[model samples]
Target: MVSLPRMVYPQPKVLTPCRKDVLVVTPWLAPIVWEGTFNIDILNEQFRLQNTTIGLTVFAIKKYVAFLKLFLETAEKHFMVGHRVHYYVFTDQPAAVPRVTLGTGRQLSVLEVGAYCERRFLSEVDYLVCVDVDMEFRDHVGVEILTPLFGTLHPSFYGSSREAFTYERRPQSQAYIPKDEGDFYYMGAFFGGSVQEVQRLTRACHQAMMVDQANGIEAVWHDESHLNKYLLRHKPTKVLSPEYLWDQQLLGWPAVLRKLRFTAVP
Candidate 1:
């Protein structure tokens, strides 16, 4: 049976909003993409910060540049020789930032921020990696991490713990695990999975945002927060080692120190 892609409300103004009622009648679209065997597609999402400003309140050009350099270096070291990789840049103003040359010698595609996640994935290659512009790689990060993590394991999803980065967890929030359970770790830097899996998660996130915004949960960082909530309840495909995606706190996490120190790029 042919199934339509999931429908989401509040589509950005640039595009006409599609029917919201369609999803109710057809929830199958959400899970069908992930069922059974599927082709592998490696995708990544990066957002360019508009200006030079620090902190959570605004985007910073420097941070964006850092992320760009990291992605470039990672691609060059790991997959540049021979690997099929597709990179998608999601930006508020794609024209403003100077075009970045990627390591694979492939041109990067710029996606409008307003477009729904599913729409982007629909046009994108599979095995997608949705990452914040701030995430930087210190070492080679090719399909070695993505291949095993995605194709066979069927990890529900994978992400870094904020606790790994010394970030606080909301006591009232679902992500808040007991301190004795271990440090609450969720590195929002990067998260990834199959294009099919991502399409499923993205569609779910999109719908959740619509419902949350309608219910007055429209705070900043909309989808990201919703993603966290989804994974918290759904668990993860696997809790990936911090090495695959390490950050500043790597030095403290002894178990992951070897992987981080030897492989992570600065």
Candidate 2:
């Protein structure tokens, strides 16, 4: 990281952890990002100066391609607009990609592969943001989330106790977690990091799932189960508040929630 030129923004008070309504930091000291926890003005400049290129991966397989249009159109409006972004759309049909015009430094690529092609990501961008395609960006999702590792809290379980989390409880499977083990139940919908760390997570998840396959068993929640297990052991550098992912229809509009950034359609 290099030094940045002079910039101006509102200052932060030393005594204030303004948003005391919720737990803003994890036991591991990773920031649990919430609306008042950061100022986009400063974060934007810090990341823009780095000339950071974030590679976003989304799987729009088969019939799911229908959601691509709204996803891209809204992403152009709110997802990392000023920074360089490469969108890797993994789909069964390349021709199905909507003709959405991206911003100045943003571009899209169509790929055919769950597409566990990690090396391609390593070569393309400084950071990777992986998410589902059935959602649209409802607000700004910027560099404030970029880190060595990060995961989003499942909208359904952010307020639930660890033991009550719907983790893969069957110890027979590789993704299993006992009733007593877990920090937070990380949903597999949104996650990313530096390419190296993301690759490590994906590699481990793929390996463990294969082990389940060989045993003729699947984790209770499939890939999401494996995701929770990995996050428990590795501990993400940051945990995105539920604002990053939500389902207005299912979770409803809770008063405490400040923003619903990327959200579910059905």
Candidate 3:
């Protein structure tokens, strides 16, 4: 990192909280990212000074390749704009990747992937952002979300009590979580971190999945179930609010969300 140039902005007051209606930080102190909680100009400048290269991984396998057109198009406009971004499109059909034009310092590469490929990003980018291919960037999703480890809250359950969360409940499956336990229901559709941490998370989930498979049992939500289990054990460095992972069709524009950064396809 390097010194940033002087810039004019509102001075932060120690006594002033950014937002008053919702939780902004976890009990463990990791930030729960919500709109109005960060200054994007400062965040962009800090990451840019380091020449940050964010690798956005999206799985567009099988019939899901259809979503890539809008996914990549909107991403070019809102996701990490002006920063070095390497979009890693993991698909069974490499040739089907949309030919979306990219801005300078940003490009896409298609790689065939199935299960067990999380170790690949370590050699390519400084940060990793794994998102669902069926979603689009409806608003800014930039450097403010970058952290060593982070998980986006499931838009459907953020307001629910821990016992109401749809966590895996079968004790025979490795993804099982007792009804009384849960910090937040993390949506597997979007989560990531530095290459090493992301690798560790995926590798652990894969091992657990294998054990469940051999036992002839599967978690209720598949990989999503495993993701929540992993995140609960290892708290994220930052937690993304529902703003970053929403489905407007299910939950209409609410009073709380200042922006719908990423949303599911209609």
Q: Determine which window of 10 residues in candidate 3 has minimal summed lDDT.
A: 113-122
User: How accurate locally is residue 76 in candidate 2, as Cα lDDT from 0 to 100?
Assistant: 96
Q: How much is 105 displaced in model 3, in angstroms?
A: 0.2
Candidate 1 regions with alpha-carbon error over 4 angstroms: 1-70, 79-81, 103-105, 112-124, 147-185, 218-225, 249-255, 261-266
- Who is ahead in lDDT, 1 or 3? 3
Write down the RMSD of all candidates, one decimal each: 15.6, 1.4, 1.4
Q: What stretches of model 3 exceed 4 Å from their correct place?
A: 113-120
Per-residue accuracy of model 1 over 178-261 as CA lDDT, tens digit each: 333431244444456656665666677778667655665452444555555555555455433444454454444443133341
Winning candidate number (lDDT): 3
Worst 10 residues of 2 by lDDT: 113-122
Per-residue accuracy of model 3 over 1-266 as CA lDDT, tens digit each? 58999999999988999999999999999999999899989998899999999999888889999999999999999999999999988898888887899999998888887653444677779999998899989999999999999999998899999999999999999999998899999999999899999988988999999999999998999999999999999999999999999999989999999999999999
lDDT of 2: 0.92
The lDDT ranking, best first, is 3, 2, 1
User: Distance from true position, residue 75, model 1, in Å?
Assistant: 3.4
Taking all chains together, each candidate's TM-score versus the true structure is 0.52, 0.96, 0.96
Total backbone collisions for each predicted model: 18, 0, 0
Q: Per-residue lDDT of 149-185 in model 2, one digit per residue for the tens? A: 9999999999999989989888789998998889998
lDDT of each: 0.41, 0.92, 0.92
